[PDB]
Design a binder for this molecule. Structure first.
Ligand SMILES: *[C@@H]1O[C@H](CO)[C@@H](O)[C@H](O)[C@H]1NC(C)=O
Ligand SMILES: *[C@@H]1O[C@H](CO)[C@@H](O)[C@H](O)[C@H]1NC(C)=O
Lengths: 23, 22, 48, 87
């Protein structure tokens, strides 16, 4: 079977605390 | 309507916005 | 009559400025280029 | 040592700044915070899990006010962008 991975899957790449930052 | 620590310094203008409005 | 035409005419300027910022594009443009230039300046620091 | 201009290295990070306590809440895994310019601003203390802000030590240009030496030699100094405590 197949389905759509709509948006899921993003993980915090590293050890940071950017606040209101588009990285 | 109209809207760091590395040696970059922003000097203030000589005529403050209060004076210009005068 | 002219007083009324003048008074109303000032009135519209408020509304055009109140809702749409497209008029203020020119001043905002100056801020962006200068502000954007600094971002490029500090960005170069991280470059090897 | 906090609230004082100290040269520091955390976990061997290195740097000079003013160590202050931070209200910002790190997620448990994170250790280093960063700023918009990707400059280290917050760290988690290794020994005690405490979140410390890095504020760079104060600095600014020094401008000299002088009437012409032809008139006098008295002089007034302008320290730019610093509060009248650091002097
Ligand atoms: C500047 O000082 C000299 C003395 O060396 C004097 O001769 C001259 O008149 C002074 N300038 C003025 C504008 O007074
Ligand atoms: C300087 O610091 C004092 C507190 O020590 C504060 O009241 C004052 O507003 C500060 N001045 C500036 C320009 O930040």
């Amino acid at each position: 079977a197949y389905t759509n991975s709509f948006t899921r899957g993003v993980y915090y790449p590293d050890k940071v605390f950017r606040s209101s930052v588009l990285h | 309507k109209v809207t760091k620590f590395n040696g970059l310094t922003v000097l203030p203008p000589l005529l403050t916005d209060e004076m210009i409005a005068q | 009559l002219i007083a009324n035409q003048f008074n109303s005419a000032i009135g519209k300027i408020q509304d055009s400025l109140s809702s749409t910022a497209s008029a203020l594009g020119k001043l905002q443009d100056v801020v962006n280029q200068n502000a954007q230039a600094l971002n490029t300046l500090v960005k170069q620091l991280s470059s090897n | 040592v906090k609230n004082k201009c100290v040269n520091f290295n955390f976990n061997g990070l290195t740097g000079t700044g003013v160590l202050t306590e931070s209200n910002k809440k790190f997620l448990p895994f994170q250790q280093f915070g960063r700023d918009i310019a990707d400059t280290t601003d917050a760290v988690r203390d290794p020994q005690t899990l405490e979140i410390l802000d890095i504020t760079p030590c104060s600095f600014g240009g020094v401008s000299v006010i002088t009437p012409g030496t032809n008139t006098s030699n008295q002089v007034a100094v302008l320290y730019q962008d610093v509060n009248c405590t650091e002097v």
